[PDB]
Design a protein around this ligand. Structure first.
Ligand SMILES: [Zn+2]
Ligand SMILES: [Zn+2]
Lengths: 405, 409
């Protein structure tokens, strides 16, 4: 099997990172800005230079197609997003886009004919910063959202995605999704420390995380600290402290894949010489298994009831967000087998963040490939070896799928 | 032994409560306002009608003196403040003042002569709302503050205490403090629910609380919750939670008199989907025993170090306020307790959880305090209330205490 040109890949990442470069060495390329256009334009140029046919759909998704023996066969698709967070890094999303480009180049150098066409994609507005929601364009593609909804999303100035697509010249003619896709692979940095600390180069992504978000309000009695003895108190902050501790306990209880976090708290009146009579805090559970999330939910509620009973606090809880994550076994195995045949260190991993691939999974057999990083930060970084390794895994996986009858 | 006239005392409280009456049934009578002046003038009028000689000092403190057999003898002093919080009750401070007036009237009715003169005092600006700080005038009296400091405290209008004293006619000529006082007693509502819930009418106040205040900053690592396994986390808020729970443990460990509280917390960045990398919170200890406060300090600092170690969090702690406990005079305390006993009144020892003028006066005179309960422990609220029975009982104890000390050679 062929090999990617690591130096060529690295050079393209270096070149692309100039567009929207921040002084801290990060990237600010918000969706459908002029800088987004400049980045898109450069990809298009490079793709066409690689002999690809580049098309654009009505959500401005860019597809660079490399020829296959069967021009009407469902393609193998790979890619990611080019747009960033306001204080994004040089590799969030774009590494997957340029990794896909290097795959095409590598197939060209090896003079390989595939049975199926290969599409390298840029998804519009993945990060969901200028327009909400995130992953909206892959969402339209995958039937999560309608085209009407996708195009009507507005920024702070009241400009819609549809209006901006026309402004920067990416109001494409192609339908958004609706055609069969044989398989899809997204190469992405981990945006975490699991691979790096485990000393593993390749993350075989098995699933996304399910999520449960809660808001909890504890009600006690505002009291002067000096004049109120401990036995008379209804301290809502102490009640919350008990819950915060128990949330951490729950996270460790369902290790390694559970995420359990209290990230926001507000005490009232929040004055140092008064017993807090109220406290609001959030809870979020993440785990790839809905059954485990149900356990976490039941434990949280049962404990909240015990705390209220013991403390005499009033308690209210409300689940405010619920999300169920599944990648295809075939793609997962293909990714693992590719890593193995390349002699690359690897491990199964769960994605702790959303990606376009999470939605593409709904319409085509989909997998993801993670590489380590030293995210959502201007200092996030990968090594040339990591960049090459992820791209070599991508090449192998895409090639295998593309030769499938 | 003489007895107070409960109906008379109650009538005086109802009448005074008219001055600055609020629709919610409270009192809004800020220090050195015209309402405060009216209240002062009425007390002065009643005191003179009861045969007292009234004097005013340079901080506007009002002293009504009931003559003693030996005019040059050190006086027994009693009283409180007449001024209120913006949403004050009908009994915060003024109960002690009118209690003192009732003591004078009761001594008159019984035709009693005392060895020592008795002073009934109104302290200027106790509540410290219009001018900061609180208890500033008893403070000057007691050496806490200079006269220059006391007179120069300004309100939001740029007007000083000195200027306002002159405006309302209470820029007195007498020196502020600096003379021998035989004993001092202040009658005051508890401003807490200890007496009410224990079913005790009289609180024998043994001390005012010492205080130690702290600021604590825990430093962790900002991290996205979904992508960060528990084992990698440096959660500053969980660290704080551990400390908050421990602070409660410390308060309950030194029951019944310890107060241990985390009243303020600030997490950062305080977003629901991220592991908090920073957390600020306050700690305050209160206790009548400085040795216990020392132990609380040591325990807090020891556990903070243990938690920082075990969690991998950076920790910072600063004691930003220190206040020594104010024990009251043993003889005054015993005098109060003995009085309650002789009157067949239910009573218990209690520690004051709030500052009073008497806390400062304790520095320059043998001082004690007498508490009565208040409904629900409510105070500095317009719905603050005592019963006639409680009002009468507090005044009866004050009468006997003042009487005993004023007859001491
Ligand atoms: Zn991304
Ligand atoms: Zn008071």
């Amino acid at each position: 099997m062929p090999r990617v040109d690591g130096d060529r890949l690295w050079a393209s990442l270096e070149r692309m990172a100039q567009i929207g470069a921040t002084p801290k060495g990060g990237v600010c390329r918000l969706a459908l800005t002029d800088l987004d256009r400049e980045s898109r334009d450069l990809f298009v140029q490079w793709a066409r230079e690689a002999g690809c046919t580049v098309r654009v759909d009505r959500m401005g998704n860019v597809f660079a197609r490399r020829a296959g023996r069967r021009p009407d066969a469902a393609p193998v698709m790979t890619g990611s997003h080019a747009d960033s967070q306001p204080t994004g890094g040089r590799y969030d999303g774009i590494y997957g886009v340029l990794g896909g480009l290097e795959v095409v180049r590598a197939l060209n150098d090896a003079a390989i004919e595939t049975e199926r066409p290969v599409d390298v994609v840029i998804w519009t507005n993945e990060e969901g910063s200028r327009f909400a929601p995130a992953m909206v364009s892959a969402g339209v593609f995958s039937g999560v959202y309608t085209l009407e909804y996708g195009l009507s999303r507005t920024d702070g100035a009241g400009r819609t995605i549809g209006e901006e697509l026309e402004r920067i010249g990416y109001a494409g003619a192609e339908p958004v999704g609706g055609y069969p896709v044989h398989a899809a692979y997204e190469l992405h940095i981990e945006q975490g420390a699991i691979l790096e600390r485990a000393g593993k180069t390749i993350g075989v992504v098995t699933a996304g995380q399910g999520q449960r978000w809660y808001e909890v309000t504890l009600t006690g009695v505002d009291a002067h600290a000096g004049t109120t003895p401990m036995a008379f108190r209804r301290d809502a902050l102490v009640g919350a402290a008990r819950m915060i501790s128990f949330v951490e306990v729950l996270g460790r209880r369902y290790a390694p894949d559970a995420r359990a976090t209290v990230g926001m708290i507000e005490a009232r009146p929040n004055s140092r010489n008064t017993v807090p009579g109220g406290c609001f805090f959030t809870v979020e559970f993440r785990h790839p298994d809905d059954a485990v999330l149900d356990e976490l939910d039941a434990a949280l509620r049962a404990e909240l009831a015990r705390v209220a009973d013991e403390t005499g606090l009033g308690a209210q809880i409300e689940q405010i967000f619920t999300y169920a994550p599944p990648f295809a076994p075939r793609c997962i195995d293909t990714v693992r087998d590719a890593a193995r045949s390349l002699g690359l260190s690897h491990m199964d991993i769960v994605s702790g963040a959303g990606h376009d691939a999470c939605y593409v999974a709904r319409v085509a057999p989909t997998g993801m490939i993670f590489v380590p990083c030293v995210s959502h930060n201007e200092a996030e970084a990968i090594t040339p070896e990591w960049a090459t390794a992820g791209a070599d895994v991508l090449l192998r996986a895409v090639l295998q799928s593309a030769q499938e009858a």
